[PDB]
Design a protein around this ligand. Structure first.
Ligand code: CLA
Ligand code: CLA
Ligand code: CLA
Ligand code: CLA
Ligand code: CLA
Ligand code: CLA
Ligand code: CLA
Ligand code: CLA
Ligand SMILES: CC1=C(/C=C/C(C)=C/C=C/C(C)=C/C=C/C=C(C)/C=C/C=C(C)/C=C/C2=C(C)CCCC2(C)C)C(C)(C)CCC1
Ligand SMILES: CC1=C(/C=C/C(C)=C/C=C/C(C)=C\C=C\C=C(C)\C=C\C=C(C)\C=C\C2=C(C)CCCC2(C)C)C(C)(C)CCC1
Ligand SMILES: CC1=C(C/C=C(\C)CCC[C@H](C)CCC[C@H](C)CCCC(C)C)C(=O)c2ccccc2C1=O
Lengths: 214, 135, 30, 29, 141, 739, 31, 80
């Protein structure tokens, strides 16, 4: 938690402290808050703007809080929540597997994600089926985001040129000329679908699981 | 040769690194009508003096950036100098005393192509030759 | 399995393409 | 042009397509 | 046709599914009515209707009829869309008429979009469907 | 000004760490080297090709040696269906005793890796029976690698450096490679099968000691010269034949049985012998087509430039202007490399599709992990070769293509309507994509709402017709080979369908992967694969055909293949270079091979467990894939290690997580771009300089953030390595776990 | 012969990398 | 260093020169356009390759082009 919070702060603090200038771009304040870069020169100046630090901080905020809610979910289910025998013995939801499992990534993959995803994936043909659909839908929206994040405007504008050619060929070329999204919008759309998809997945996961065991 | 007093509050961790001692350094001189606050190239609100100001800077881009800010203060007498480790100060901006955006007689065309950009040769034509397609 | 001798012959025979790979690599660098 | 060559070849491919469909529909055995 | 396909009304897997048929809508017979309709389809071993899309006339309902109905509605939408774009291009503020619809122009076009196949053939056989390749912008080769 | 790299004064004078990275990236790009001439380019390339062959033969030697030395080949011979083949020994100091115990398997004395490459099956099939034979194979391959390494060195020496004219002598190479490298290699292999493999298959020991004395056939080459060839098909191996024994064995060396050997469930060796003999004769004939030094033969330049079809004038071959195509191909190595990568990529997929459905190696059909490994392996290679073909095709267009030399030909015409090609590819991709995802999502929702009878299940009736046309009577269509009345089935005049009895037995048995039964699940996924192939093509073709320029960047050819962008002006030009289409395409290439291998694996898992129903009913909605394939078959893999202990799948469990880590690491380089990192590294440089004892030491190369292009390279590599290791782990662990 | 693993694996693990990285480092920094 | 070439399509608007953050460019006398001045790149050793000049250029296609070449301390924009 300390790690993932300190890295989010590194990105965001760097964003605020170097928003106006840096050793790379002295006049960054003139370029503004939200600009894509100052070109491929100086080795390449992609994502120097304060906006682009917010963009990168969102992924780290997402990464940070994901592990916080996963921590909470598993720790409460293994060590707190559960049934109480008349004698007073506590039988926990995941039987105190946190201590030995939550100390390896394999333990998180197996005993948390794999184990507790059983309810959401087996939800079809029941009242929880919606969470099963949301779970896949969210996995899709997340993956869709990678198209925007990994690609660049140049490719899409050149593809649109050929599509515009075909619309011109059949005299259905729009007066409002089609353009590929801005470099900044590409990133904004990227991080939007990434957060929506990622968070919605965990949302569907948490509900389907805890509405069955909890 | 560089006259001018260092502006007040000129100190920050964004200043000269070892490059300034080993490779090259830049200076920007200007005459201010009045003592006034200005943002330094690499962060920090410095104070100009009334009269000649001298600010050492790591990169020429710092000088041109600061120059742009001095123009907003109605100051156009700023001179940038490149300084080598041998102490060889060279006046570099404005090169001929006139600002490059203004036309000055005596300047010759450099890297001018007497053609439209569409009329460049194909890379195949200049293949295994020294020349490029934009030559 | 194969004898200790056969393993030692293979290693000694493998010095031949080892040497020639070095000679080719140095020649290709020129 | 009147496009005689390319139409001729397209018709031949579309003939083969129909001939294979005639086998599919058990018209020719 | 093939891969253990039987008429749904003969497949035991279908009848088993029909007896526990879930009501789609508020109509409490909607579950039974579904399997009554799907009885005429070809069912696989598991008793799900398999659709045959090879242009078999006895299976025309599967894909051929849906295809004709889709192509007629999709072609309408495309023709009406094309018609409007060509209509607003003859005006001055064409870009403004894209984001802010001239319903005076649009609604008549939408109304007359039922006859798009006739209009599409007429315009194809008049050289008024396409532009010349020499008069359309292209990239340097 | 440092020496390295010797081949670039531009990079050699770079004072930053970019010098080191760009030298690695540009080392093998010989065209881009300083003072490189065309003759020196071909002569260096030729010498290098000897280096690569040597590496392949040293790799091949390693497989033989490690199995001969550390394997259980001799034990595996005796029971190939139950013994696990050993790859090599494990010597890892980091192992605890539980891990050593866990990896002590397949009757080994120490910890070993089980082989999933199918080399044991291959070597057994081709007549190797002893570790001594495997060893002798390995030492031979060292000497054979050694001979090519020397040839490589020799052909760089002044007197032995071939001329440019020699490299451009296309027709002579086509004759020699078709007749010699293909034809005689095929004939020589037919020789091996007839002289060694087939005897060994019949329990007869034939080696270098006794092969000159022991005749492959009793008749002994007399019927061949007298032309009584049918003698070599007389008395084939019976259906009772037990492989590597005389029990049920025949004397025939050239049969034509069709279908599989019933014990081994693989192609008859005598069929494979007659194949390679027939193939050899066809290739020797084909390599007598082109004129070299004896007047006779076709000139390919004349064939391309021909403008007359028997008096009648034509635009060229097939009335298509191919003028200047011979020179285009022959003069551009990127045209060739691209073209030859396309052909090899197709053949690699061909191999993959055929080796699972028509196994050639004894008992490999029952080694399920090996079959899964080998199919995935070759489909992944095919995908890389195919992306490379288009990459080098784009490099040709941007660096080598002369419009003036290709004036009026097929290549100029393709570039003239490139917008029409790219727009129609965009349509097919969108058309496939919308409706395929549509049907899956429809199915996934109606199943979710407890109404799986509302699914859109399309019978793949056209593919089923082809299976029926190949004589699969399951579908009850009664057409071509499934109709015993058809002229196809009977071969009406000659009645020489001697392949057919064996073929029909193989295709109508449900115990093999020869034309697997297909249904709605197979329809939807074939349409997903089509989507995959069209969209990867769209990206690569668009990349190739826009490599020289576009509206956004009309002078793109002036900037070359790979460059970061043309800056944020004109709306922004990120990923505008032809290289950036290669980069984008590989994501789609990997996505597509993902769908292909997932499909292959899940269908086969059902078939191998005798539970085809699972795939058949659950493959029509994407929750079925998610649950019944990924989730279900992860169970054993992720328990490779746990708090309770370890098993032999601990290494795959660890590689599985390693893949997930390397993939995710790739996202960093793909999402966070250079300007962020350059500003961060500036503060690290500050901190080092200002730290009182650390500032003692100083970098020689100025620390800089990776370049825009380098980040896409590094990002795409981490992503790819992650993709491959993750699936390799899952594919192997899940199959080897069950089997 | 198994003892060769105790020689070769450490050599390929440590000696070969150190020797290769040492030489390549001295080569890329040579002026 | 990077190479900055000016083409005869220049209209002498001076926008490239004003845009340049390292004073690479300057206006020089010319008879080719109405403005009677053309952009020049005398100090390409100071060019960082930002392409602000290309973004500034109002001609179609551009009358100034930056071809990113050998990277140096000045071209990499390093203060260290
Ligand atoms: C332009 C007119 C045209 C027409 C009339 C047809 C008609 C047909 N095609 Mg063909 N096809 C066409 C163009 C056309 N095709 C083109 C341009 C391609 C290239 C993609 C194909 C590729 C194709 C395939 C792969 C198949 C068909 C098949 C068919 C048959 C489907 C069965 C039916 O009757 O419904 C039908 C005869 C199917 C068939 O079974 O016939 C052999 C089939 O499998 N077509
Ligand atoms: C009148 C509107 C119209 C018409 C007639 C066409 C026609 C075409 N499109 Mg285009 N397209 C349109 C709008 C239209 N498009 C819009 C708004 C977009 C942005 C999403 C696109 C994006 C697009 C892409 C990316 C591609 C095409 C392609 C094509 C061609 C193949 C068919 C296809 O792929 O459909 C594609 C359909 C869509 C992407 C969805 C269309 C969205 C709606 C339903 C249309 C707009 C209707 C409009 C609001 C109606 C207002 C009318 C009213 C004012 C009277 C065909 C010439 C392809 C091509 O180039 O083939 C050679 C291709 O790759 N189109
Ligand atoms: C089969 C793989 C293969 C082959 C045959 C070659 C062949 C070659 N490389 Mg390339 N290279 C490769 C993979 C390969 N490379 C890989 C994976 C990288 C990292 C991306 C590079 C990066 C690279 C760089 C940076 C350079 C080369 C150079 C060369 C040439 C000289 C070799 C040399 O000096 O090594 C010497 C090797 C040894 C002494 C050890 C081999 C013997 C041992 C037993 C030669 C044509 C060099 C060149 O072209 O210089 C003019 C050069 O500077 N390569
Ligand atoms: C079949 C033979 C073949 C040949 C002879 C070539 C030859 C060439 N290619 Mg082509 N290419 C090929 C196939 C081939 N390629 C294939 C299959 C693809 C698809 C991937 C490509 C895609 C491609 C691109 C996109 C480019 C080239 C380029 C080139 C040129 C320069 C290569 C270079 O210097 O990189 C040096 C070598 C590297 C950078 C290698 C590092 C990458 C490897 C795979 C990393 C693997 C990661 C790691 C080691 C694994 C770790 C394991 C883990 C468990 C820890 C050279 C002419 C370049 C060019 O400009 O052409 C003129 C170029 O930009 N090729
Ligand atoms: C799940 C992940 C994902 C998805 C769905 C897509 C989808 C697409 N890619 Mg992308 N891509 C991806 C990852 C993905 N990509 C990644 C990781 C990369 C590496 C950077 C790329 C790089 C890339 C390149 C280089 C290209 C593509 C192209 C395409 C399009 C291919 C056309 C098609 O076949 O589908 C049809 C369309 C879809 C499947 C889109 C989804 C349809 C939605 C779900 C319908 C929405 C309607 C609904 C009512 C709206 C609800 C939302 C609400 C807020 C209103 C398609 C839109 C190509 C293209 O544009 O070709 C035309 C193209 O050239 N992609
Ligand atoms: C448009 C792109 C497209 C592509 C790339 C494919 C590709 C494929 N199809 Mg699919 N197919 C398509 C469209 C396409 N199909 C459509 C629209 C249908 C009707 C639902 C089908 C029905 C179908 C069946 C029944 C089967 C396949 C199969 C396959 C696979 C083998 C080749 C084949 O049989 O082609 C079939 C080719 C066609 C049907 C014609 C090509 C598409 C045309 C040109 C597009 C225009 C169609 C138009 C919209 C229909 C209007 C009809 C109306 C006028 C009556 C291959 C993956 C086979 C398979 O599963 O292999 C394992 C198989 O058995 N396809
Ligand atoms: C928590 C987050 C998480 C993340 C981010 C990942 C990430 C990954 N997983 Mg892991 N995984 C996880 C949790 C996670 N996993 C958990 C909890 C388990 C249970 C133990 C697994 C078990 C697992 C398995 C078994 C596999 C992965 C694989 C992967 C890699 C996929 C690479 C890729 O881009 O595929 C591209 C995406 C796909 C191919 C989609 C596949 C899934 C769909 C539903 C099936 C599609 C088939 C269908 C016919 C296509 C229809 C297309 C149509 C709609 C157009 C990627 C590294 C896979 C891999 O090795 O790489 C290929 C793999 O096989 N993971
Ligand atoms: C690739 C081959 C390789 C090999 C053969 C080894 C071998 C070893 N490693 Mg591993 N290691 C490796 C790669 C390798 N490492 C890599 C890449 C990493 C990073 C991921 C690690 C990370 C790692 C850690 C964190 C540790 C080991 C440790 C060990 C030792 C554990 C055995 C033991 O318990 O006895 C006890 C053995 C000793 C106490 C040391 C014996 C004498 C040493 C090896 C050398 C003596 C001086 C030598 C003669 C000359 C100078 C050294 C060098 C130049 C040769 C063993 C020597 C453990 C260890 O013991 O570290 C020292 C340990 O804690 N390794
Ligand atoms: C089925 C069958 C058959 C047939 C078949 C066929 C006929 C086939 C075909 C096939 C084919 C037909 C294939 C294809 C392929 C292709 C490809 C794969 C391509 C690629 C390409 C490329 C990659 C290119 C490149 C380039 C570019 C892009 C640019 C310029 C340059 C170059 C040209 C280089 C028969 C009758 C025999 C028998 C029965 C069965
Ligand atoms: C029969 C059948 C089938 C088949 C089919 C096919 C194969 C088809 C083909 C087809 C084709 C091969 C076509 C093509 C074409 C071409 C072109 C060239 C086109 C164009 C078009 C246009 C131009 C249009 C326009 C329009 C309109 C009309 C409307 C709207 C708007 C627009 C403008 C878009 C199947 C099996 C599926 C199913 C069953 C039946
Ligand atoms: C896919 C992709 C695109 C292409 C995507 C585009 C151009 C977005 C277009 C999608 C919208 C939904 C088009 C909407 C058109 C009409 C408004 C729809 C009218 C019909 C409705 C009323 C139904 C980029 O432009 C881009 C830019 C920079 C980085 C990455 C990417 C990127 O990944």
């Amino acid at each position: 938690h300390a790690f993932t919070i300190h890295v989010t702060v590194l990105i965001l603090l760097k964003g605020v402290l170097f928003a106006r200038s840096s050793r790379l771009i002295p006049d960054k304040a003139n370029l503004g808050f939200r600009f894509p870069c100052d070109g491929p020169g100086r080795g390449g100046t992609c994502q120097v703007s304060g906006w682009d630090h917010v963009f990168l901080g969102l992924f780290w905020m997402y990464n940070s809080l994901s592990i916080v809610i996963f921590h909470f979910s598993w720790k409460m289910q293994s060590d707190v929540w559960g049934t109480v025998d008349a004698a007073g013995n506590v039988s926990h939801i995941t039987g105190g597997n946190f201590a030995q499992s939550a100390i390896t990534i394999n333990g998180w993959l197996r005993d948390f994600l794999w184990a507790q995803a059983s309810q959401v994936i087996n939800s079809y043909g029941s009242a929880l089926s919606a969470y099963g659909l949301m779970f896949l839908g969210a996995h899709f929206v997340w993956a869709f985001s990678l198209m925007f994040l990994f690609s660049g405007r140049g490719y899409w504008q050149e593809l649109i040129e050929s599509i515009v050619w075909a619309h011109n060929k059949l005299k259905v070329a729009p007066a409002i000329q089609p353009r590929a999204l801005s470099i900044t919008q590409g990133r904004a759309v990227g991080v939007a679908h990434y957060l929506l998809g990622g968070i919605a997945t965990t949302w569907a996961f948490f509900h389907a699981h805890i509405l069955s065991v909890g | 040769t560089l006259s001018g007093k260092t502006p007040l509050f000129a100190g920050s961790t964004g200043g000269l690194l070892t490059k300034a001692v080993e490779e090259e350094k830049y200076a920007i001189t200007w005459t201010s009508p009045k003592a006034q606050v200005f943002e330094l190239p690499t962060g920090g609100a410095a104070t100009m003096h009334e009269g000649e100001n001298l600010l050492y800077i790591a990169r020429k881009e710092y000088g041109i950036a600061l120059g742009g800010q001095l123009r907003k203060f109605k100051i156009t007498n700023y001179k940038i100098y490149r300084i080598l480790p041998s102490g060889e100060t060279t006046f570099i901006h404005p090169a001929d005393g006139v600002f490059p955006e203004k036309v000055n007689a005596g300047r010759e065309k450099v890297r001018f192509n007497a053609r439209s950009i569409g009329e460049n040769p194909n890379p195949s034509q200049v293949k295994f030759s020294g020349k490029a397609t934009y030559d | 399995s194969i004898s200790d001798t056969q393993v030692y012959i293979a290693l000694v025979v493998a010095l031949i393409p080892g040497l020639l790979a070095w000679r080719l690599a140095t020649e290709l660098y020129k | 042009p009147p496009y005689t060559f390319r139409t001729g070849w397209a018709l031949l491919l579309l003939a083969v397509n129909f001939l294979v469909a005639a086998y599919y529909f058990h018209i020719i055995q | 046709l093939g891969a253990d396909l039987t008429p749904c009304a003969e497949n035991p897997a279908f009848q088993a599914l029909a007896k526990n048929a879930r009501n789609t809508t508020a109509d409490p017979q909607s579950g039974q009515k579904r399997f009554e309709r799907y009885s005429q389809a070809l069912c696989g071993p598991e008793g799900y209707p398999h659709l045959i899309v090879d242009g078999r006339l006895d299976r025309a309902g599967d894909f051929l009829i849906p295809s004709i109905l889709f192509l007629y509605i999709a072609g309408w939408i495309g023709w009406v869309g094309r018609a409007y774009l060509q209509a607003i291009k003859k005006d001055s503020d064409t870009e403004q008429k894209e984001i802010q619809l001239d319903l005076g122009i649009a609604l008549p076009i939408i109304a007359t979009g039922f006859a798009w196949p006739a209009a599409a053939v007429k315009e194809l056989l008049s050289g008024e469907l396409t532009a010349k390749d020499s008069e359309i912008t292209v990239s340097p080769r | 000004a440092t020496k390295f790299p010797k081949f670039s004064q531009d990079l050699a004078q770079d004072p930053t760490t970019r010098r080191i990275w760009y030298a690695m990236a540009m080392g093998n790009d010989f065209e881009s080297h300083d003072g490189m001439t065309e003759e020196n380019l071909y002569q260096k390339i030729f010498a290098t090709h000897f280096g690569h062959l040597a590496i392949i033969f040293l790799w091949a030697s390693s497989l033989l040696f490690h199995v001969a030395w550390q394997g259980n080949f001799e034990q595996w011979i005796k029971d190939p269906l139950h013994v696990r083949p050993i790859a090599h020994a494990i010597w890892d100091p980091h192992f605890g005793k539980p891990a050593i115990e866990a990896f002590t398997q397949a009757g080994a004395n120490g910890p070993v890796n089980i082989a999933y490459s199918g080399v044991y099956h291959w070597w057994y099939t081709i007549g190797m029976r002893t570790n001594t034979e495997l060893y002798t194979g390995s030492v031979f391959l060292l000497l054979f690698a050694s001979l090519f390494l020397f040839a490589g060195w020799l052909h760089l020496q002044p007197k032995f450096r071939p001329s440019l004219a020699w490299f451009k002598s296309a027709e002579s190479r086509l004759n020699h490679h078709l007749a010699g490298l293909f034809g005689v290699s095929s004939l020589a292999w037919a020789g091996h099968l007839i002289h060694v493999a087939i005897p060994e298959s019949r329990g007869q020991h034939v080696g270098w000691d006794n092969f000159l004395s022991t005749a492959p056939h009793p008749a002994g080459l007399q019927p061949f010269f007298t032309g009584n060839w049918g003698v070599y098909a007389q008395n084939p191996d019976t259906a009772g034949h037990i492989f590597s024994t005389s029990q049920g064995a025949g004397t025939a060396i050239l049969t034509f049985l069709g279908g599989f050997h019933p014990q081994t469930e693989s192609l008859w060796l005598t069929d494979m012998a007659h194949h390679h003999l027939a193939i050899a004769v066809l290739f020797i004939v084909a390599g007598h087509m082109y004129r070299t030094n004896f007047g006779i033969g076709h000139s390919i330049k004349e064939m391309m430039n021909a403008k007359t079809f028997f008096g009648k004038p034509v635009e060229g071959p097939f009335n298509m202007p191919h003028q200047g195509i011979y020179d285009t191909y022959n003069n551009s190595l990127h045209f060739q490399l691209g073209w030859h990568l396309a052909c090899l990529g197709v053949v690699t997929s061909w191999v993959a599709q055929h080796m699972y459905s028509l196994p050639s190696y004894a008992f490999i059909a029952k080694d399920y992990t090996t079959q899964a490994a080998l199919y995935t392996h070759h489909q992944y290679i095919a995908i890389f070769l195919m992306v490379g073909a288009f990459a080098h095709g784009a490099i040709f267009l941007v660096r080598d293509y002369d419009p003036e030399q290709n004036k009026g030909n097929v290549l100029e015409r393709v570039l003239q309507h490139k917008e029409a090609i790219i727009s129609h590819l965009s349509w097919v991709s969108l058309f496939l994509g919308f409706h395929t995802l549509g049907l899956y999502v429809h199915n996934d929702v109606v199943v979710a709402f407890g109404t799986p009878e509302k699914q859109i299940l399309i019978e793949p009736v056209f593919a089923q017709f082809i299976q029926a046309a190949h004589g699969k009577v399951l579908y009850g269509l009664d057409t071509l080979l499934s109709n015993p009345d058809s002229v196809a089935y009977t071969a009406y005049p000659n009645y020489a369908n001697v392949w057919l009895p064996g073929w029909l037995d193989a295709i109508n048995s449900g115990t093999n992967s020869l034309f697997l039964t297909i249904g709605p699940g197979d329809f939807l996924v074939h349409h997903a694969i089509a989507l995959g192939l069209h969209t990867t093509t769209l990206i690569l073709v668009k990349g190739a055909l826009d490599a020289r320029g576009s509206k956004l960047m009309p002078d793109k050819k002036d900037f070359g293949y790979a460059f970061p962008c043309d800056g944020p002006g004109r709306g922004g030009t990120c990923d505008i270079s032809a290289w950036d289409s290669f980069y984008l395409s590989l994501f789609w290439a990997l996505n597509t091979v993902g769908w292909v291998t997932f499909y292959w694996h899940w269908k086969h898992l059902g078939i191998w467990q005798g539970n085809v129903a699972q795939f058949n009913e659950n493959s029509t909605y994407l929750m079925g894939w998610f649950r019944d394939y990924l989730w279900a078959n992860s169970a054993q893999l992720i328990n490779g290690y746990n708090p309770y202990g370890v098993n032999n799948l601990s290494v795959w469990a660890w590689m599985f997580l390693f893949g997930h880590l390397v993939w995710a690491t790739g996202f960093m380089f793909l999402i966070s771009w250079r300007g962020y990192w350059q500003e961060l590294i500036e503060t690290l440089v500050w901190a080092h300089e200002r730290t009182p004892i650390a500032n003692l030491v100083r970098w020689k190369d100025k620390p800089v953030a990776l370049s825009i292009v380098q980040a896409r390279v590094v990002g795409l590599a981490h992503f790819t390595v992650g993709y491959v290791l993750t699936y390799a782990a899952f594919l192997i662990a899940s199959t080897a776990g069950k089997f | 012969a198994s003892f060769l693993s105790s020689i070769f694996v450490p050599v390929i693990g440590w000696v070969v990398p150190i020797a290769t990285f040492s030489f390549l480092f001295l080569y890329i920094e040579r002026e | 260093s990077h190479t900055v070439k000016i083409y005869d399509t220049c209209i002498g608007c001076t926008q490239c020169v004003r845009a340049c953050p390292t004073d690479v460019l300057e206006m020089v006398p010319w008879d080719g356009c109405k403005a009677a001045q053309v952009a020049s790149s005398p100090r390409t050793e100071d060019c960082v390759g930002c392409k602000r000049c290309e973004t500034a250029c109002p001609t179609d296609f551009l009358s100034i082009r930056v071809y990113l070449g050998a990277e140096t301390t000045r071209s990499m924009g390093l203060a260290y």
